[PDB]
Amino acid sequence: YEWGVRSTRKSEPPPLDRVYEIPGLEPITFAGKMHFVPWLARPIFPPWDRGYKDPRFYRSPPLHEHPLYKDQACYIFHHRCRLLEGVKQALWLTKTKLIEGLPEKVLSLVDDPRNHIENQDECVLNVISHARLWQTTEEIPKRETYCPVIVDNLIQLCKSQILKHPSLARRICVQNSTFSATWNRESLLLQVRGSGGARLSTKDPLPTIASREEIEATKNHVLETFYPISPIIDLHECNIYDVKNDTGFQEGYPYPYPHTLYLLDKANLRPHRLQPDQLRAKMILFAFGSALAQARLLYGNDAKVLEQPVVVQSVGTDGRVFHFLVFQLNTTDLDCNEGVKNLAWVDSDQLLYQHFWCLPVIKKRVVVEPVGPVGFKPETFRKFLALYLHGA
Amino acid sequence: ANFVSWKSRTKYTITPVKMRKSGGRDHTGRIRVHGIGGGHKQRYRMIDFLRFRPEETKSGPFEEKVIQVRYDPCRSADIALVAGGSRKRWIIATENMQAGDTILNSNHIGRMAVAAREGDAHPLGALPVGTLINNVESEPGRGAQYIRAAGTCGVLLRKVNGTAIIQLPSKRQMQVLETCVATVGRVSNVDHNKRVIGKAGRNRWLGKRPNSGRWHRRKIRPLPPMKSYVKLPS
Amino acid sequence: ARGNEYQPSNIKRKNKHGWVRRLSTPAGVQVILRRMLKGRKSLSH
Amino acid sequence: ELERVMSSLLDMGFSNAHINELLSVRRGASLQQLLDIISEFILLGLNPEPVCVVLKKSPQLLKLPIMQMRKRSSYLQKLGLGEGKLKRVLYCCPEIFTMRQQDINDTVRLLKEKCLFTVQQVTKILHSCPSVLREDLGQLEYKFQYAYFRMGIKHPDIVKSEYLQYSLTKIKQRHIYLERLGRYQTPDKKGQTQIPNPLLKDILRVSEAEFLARTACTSVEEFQVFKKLLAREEEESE
RNA sequence: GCUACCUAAGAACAGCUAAAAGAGCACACCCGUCUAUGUAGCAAAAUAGUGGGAAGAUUUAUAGGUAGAGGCGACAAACCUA
RNA sequence: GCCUGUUUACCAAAAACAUCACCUCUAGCAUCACCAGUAUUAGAGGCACCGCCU
RNA sequence: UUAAUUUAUUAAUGCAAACAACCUGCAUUAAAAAUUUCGGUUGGGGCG
Ligand SMILES: [Mg+2]
Ligand SMILES: [Mg+2]
Ligand SMILES: [Mg+2]
Ligand SMILES: [Mg+2]
Ligand SMILES: [Mg+2]
Ligand SMILES: [Mg+2]
Ligand SMILES: [Mg+2]
Ligand SMILES: [Mg+2]
Ligand SMILES: [Mg+2]
Ligand SMILES: [Mg+2]
């Protein structure tokens, strides 16, 4: 069954006048008249070329003629790729082993009450209320508005700890930063073009979480596979691409080392919003891409087990539910499925507040639920603060 | 009239496609089918009825994973999003198709009959006689056209030479080359018969307009020898 | 109840009785020709 | 090959005795043609023993062109004549495969458009009264209208009782005899009769003696006189 | 450009009772049961009261379509510029 | 009359029309309606929910 | 409408034409329609 009905398909040109089939005679067409008339033969106009370059009337060359065209098809992963298998697919692509829960090294950063923010619960409740209720003149702010706002306000609240931690001065949250990283996986060349937003850069690299013994023990772990779904599914298969690895910044940029990738799923429509598993997969892939770009920049474009693993954190949130990730890239030898494997600690579905009431629900003229968050969970914010304070 | 069919998309995709209602009107704007109009706005999901469609630069039998089973507004039967290799496609889900199940699509006519597991596609020659089938083709590679409504199931009545006799749900025999593919089991949503519309409003939602109010009363024309007995008075 | 059958709208006016539509068909062209022959100041609407 | 044909017929239900009988039945017909015709028959759904009996009766079918046989089988399937339905139809009229498709189509069209028999009713009529196919047009319409108007028999009854099986001569003889005797009465415009009419089975199916005794209650001599008189009247009318 | 139906993409539906309703009461809104006025009238079908529906088969703005040996019609032979 | 609804704009709003439900007839099928559908479907029509006895 | 006259038009078939189908010509059968009419006396109505 072919798609596209004939009536909608472009109409076939009318049959040529029989006069054109007679070798010896030149047909009399209305070309000289410079307009159509129904009683003269239809001219066969030669193909026309503008003769110069007009940007607003540009006709790009066929895909095969582009300089970067390559027979080998790369598979790109960008901010708007939704993996079918989600976390499993991301782990297979990045040659990564998953660990439930954040590492103790970072989780302990908030155990002592000195790191605890003064009036922390009040501040977090105020941030949530500002994001969800007080943000704009509209009664019910949309996600497109309160997701970036909630993330930024949480980041500012954490940044307020500069008092206790002067080392927080050596970092900056840049926006619109884009990185690119390419690598091979069983002869499949995979690129990640991470755009997202809110890259937290630091002047110093993050300390390694996994020890040499753990990195080696990752060898025994077998990379989970899924059949018949290929790992390439949902990745943009492109034959016109470039293989350069880009960290997103020119050489000599202060704050070169990525610290946290803040990914936000702010789409108003549920279908346009990533599922939690797909968002975790995107977090894994972007963290791996940034770490791999850092490794390629530092230790060259050589496939090898990294002597100094690269650590990158990421927080992927939909405005209410958060997902926390710490990715340790400890090998650029991705092609083979055997050997030491990168490893990611993930905390999934940490919901800051289970629901928010913008209006007071009234039954029989009785206020049942007051305006404001209900079911607030400070554990998610302590995890957020632990990630922010990590490395300082 | 300036009517152009909405069925203009040329490339298959999983996205629901915005479809324009016809109202029973031709491209000329005149009503051609009565009782059609209005109803809930719908989006069309392009169903891949050629279940054995090996991916590009690929061939031979292939397996697929049932990502999900979904209600289809444009059909009585329900559809299934199913993914294989690096592609996804909509198919017509069978009675017991479940999310996460595995489906087989093969073109191999084995010497022995293949174990008929519901939901997979084999050439009619590969099926045991008497197995319930659906999404049957008329010609090899034409694409499923028969036994596509909810709960319908044809029977592979006979197999002789390269020709298989199928019993369509209307209990009519049909001859098809045994190389043409069909899927095992009965179509999903088997309980579609028992659905009760309940009220005229539900039909209007479904898009069916009320029947004409006109009262409609041919006849056997008597032969001259019989005209004397047509209306014998009481 | 009746009398106000005219609900003005320039889009409908031009799309129904405009110069382009009159020229769009031979019958409309003959309409314009008849108006021109009669000497109408307003050939189309 | 004889080996291939014998293997195919060992499949398809036929036994060794049936295969040997079919081979003897071959009147100088190629083994491939025999296999093709038997395949078409079993595709229509005839069991191997009915197929063997039919071919024993009429070996001429083996000579039919394969394309013609396939076209006729498809037409029969569309008409719904298959399996046991086609079995006794072939038993009665083996020429259905030789009759002109135009003849069959015009018979069906007379039964449907000019006799207003439903599709299922027409299939049942063909199943139960194969002689209708041999019966010429015009005569069949006259028989049906005789049942419908003069006898006041509706389509469901005309189909349930194999009225079209009997001959118009017998039908007119018995019915007109009863009508003139007063036993039968054509229904009025409202479809009502003073006395309930005798059943079509009691008129046609029963033997002559039973019809004259149980229903007509008259003498065979009088019936013979009436038959001669009716024949003379028909001759004069024509 | 009315009206019958339809197509595309829109919009409206207070409050109370119930609970997810072709539910009840009742605004806006749509209609037009009965009475009265009016009858060259405010009106070539209106006004006042009364009344039916009023989250639905609802109402409705915009653009488009179906044209007369035709259209459209939940048939009234209704409507298709009084 | 099952019901909610529809109708003779401008003398008839109804027991009339429609209506879920049930019943009858027709059709084995692709690239402009039906339908990007396939007999549990689609069209034509009768009657009027449901429920009972025969 | 079982009033009269038609099949111009569609759908089928048949025969020609041409090499199974399509197209054309001629027939036949239906569907659909098209044109036209509906005498006189007998208070009306029925049967006359
Ligand atoms: Mg208006
Ligand atoms: Mg309300
Ligand atoms: Mg209500
Ligand atoms: Mg009426
Ligand atoms: Mg009338
Ligand atoms: Mg009523
Ligand atoms: Mg009402
Ligand atoms: Mg209406
Ligand atoms: Mg009125
Ligand atoms: Mg009124």
B113 Cβ contacts chain F strand, under 7 Å: no
Distance from residue D159's CA to nucleotide G5's C1', rounded to whole Å: 39
> What is the CB-side half-sphere exposure of residue C4 using CA atoms within 13 A?
3
Domain count across chain C: 1
Q: C-alpha distances in angstroms, A253 versus A77, A201, A250, A257, A258? A: 26, 10, 6, 10, 12
Q: C-alpha distances in angstroms, D100 versus D76, D108, D134? A: 13, 13, 11
- Contact predicate D81/D99, CB 8 Å: no
Query: Looking at this protein, which amino acid is placed at residue B74?
Result: C
* The Cα angle at residue B89 between residues B87 and B95, in degrees rounded to 5: 135
Resolution as reported, in Å = 2.7
d(C-alpha A82, C-alpha A279), whole Å: 8
Quick one: which of A40, A96, A37, A26 has its CA closest to A289?
A: A96
Q: Which listed CATH number (2.60.220.30, 2.60.120.260, 3.30.200.20, 2.40.50.140) goes with B1-106?
A: 2.40.50.140
Helix (H, G, I), strand (E, B) or coil at A221: coil
Look up the CATH number of the domain holding residue C29. Answer: 1.10.287.3980
Q: C-alpha distances in angstroms, D206 versus D156, D166, D210? A: 20, 11, 6
Q: Which of D7, D43, D141, D194 to mutate to test the interface with B (most CBs of B within 10 A)?
A: D43
Residue showing tokens 């295969």: D19
* The Cα angle at residue A158 between residues A152 and A160, in degrees rounded to 5: 105
* The Cα angle at residue A217 between residues A211 and A220, in degrees rounded to 5: 160
d(C-alpha D225, C-alpha A344), whole Å: 111
- Contact predicate A375/A191, CB 8 Å: no
d(C-alpha B177, C-alpha B175), whole Å: 7
Nucleotide nearest to A5 (CA to C1'): F31
d(C-alpha B109, C-alpha B140), whole Å: 13
Bridge partner residues of A311 (DSSP): A328
Bridge partner residues of A307 (DSSP): none
Residue showing tokens 């891949």: B48
Bridge partner residues of A347 (DSSP): A324
Buried b (16+ CB within 10 A) or exposed e, A229-265: bbbbbbbeeeeebeeebbbbbeeeeebbbbbbbbbbb
**A and B make contact (3+ CB pairs below 8 Å):** yes
Q: How far B30 CA lies from chain A's nearest CA (Å)?
A: 18
Query: Which residues touch B109 (CB under 8 Å, ≥6 apart)?
Result: B123, B125, B126, B178, B179
Range B107-187 has CATH code 3.20.20.10: no
> How do the domains of chain D map onto residue ranges?
1-238
Q: What residue has its CA nearest to the C1' of F43?
A: B33
Query: Which residues touch A80 (CB under 8 Å, ≥6 apart)?
Result: none
Q: What residue has its CA nearest to the C1' of E9?
A: B20
- How far apart, in Å, do the first and last CA atoms of chain C sit? 28
Three-class secondary structure assignment of chain B: CCCCCCCCCCCCCCCCEECCCCCCECCCCCECCCCECCCCCCEECCECCCCCCCCCCCCCCEEEEEEEEECCCCCCCCEEEEEEECEEEEEECECCCCCCCEEEECCCCCCCCCCCCCCCEEEHHHCCCCCEEECECCCCCCCCCECCCCCCCEEEEEEECCEEEEECCCCCEEEEECCCEEEECCECCHHHCCCCCCCHHHHHHHCECCCCCCCCCCCCCCCHHHHHHCCCCC
- Hey, what are D159's tokens? 């189909």
- Hey, what are D221's tokens? 């001599």
- Contact predicate B124/B176, CB 8 Å: yes
Residue showing tokens 């390694």: A208
Burial class (CB in 10 A: 0-12, 13-18, 19+), A323: buried
Distance D119 CA to ligand 7 centre (A): 42
Query: Looking at this protein, which amino acid is placed at residue B63?
Result: E
Quick one: which of A207, A209, A177 has its CA closest to A194?
A: A177
Burial class (CB in 10 A: 0-12, 13-18, 19+), D232: exposed
- Hey, what are A9's tokens? 């398909």
Bridge partner residues of A359 (DSSP): none
For A162, phi and psi rounded to 5 degrees? -55, -30
Q: Is residue B99 less than 8 Å (CB to CB) from chain A? A: no
All CATH 2.40.50.140 domain ranges in chain B, comma separated: 1-106
Pairwise CB contact (< 8 Å): D188 & B158? no
Nucleotide nearest to B146 (CA to C1'): F38
Residue showing tokens 């999901």: B45
Compare all CA atoms of chain A with the CA of B87 and give the residue at the minimum distance: A233
d(C-alpha A109, C-alpha A392), whole Å: 10
Pairwise CB contact (< 8 Å): B220 & D189? no
Distance D176 CA to ligand 7 centre (A): 59
- Contact predicate B138/B176, CB 8 Å: yes
Distance from residue A349's CA to nucleotide E26's C1', rounded to whole Å: 47
Cα torsion A375, A381, A384, A390: sign: negative
Distance B37 CA to ligand 9 centre (A): 28
DSSP A133: I
CB-closest option in A1, A4, A229 to B10: A4
All CATH 2.30.30.30 domain ranges in chain B, comma separated: 107-187
Helix (H, G, I), strand (E, B) or coil at A290: helix
Give the CA-trace dihedral at A343, A347, A349, A353, to 10 degrees: -150
Helix (H, G, I), strand (E, B) or coil at A229: strand
Nucleotide nearest to A365 (CA to C1'): E16
A10 Cβ contacts chain F strand, under 7 Å: no
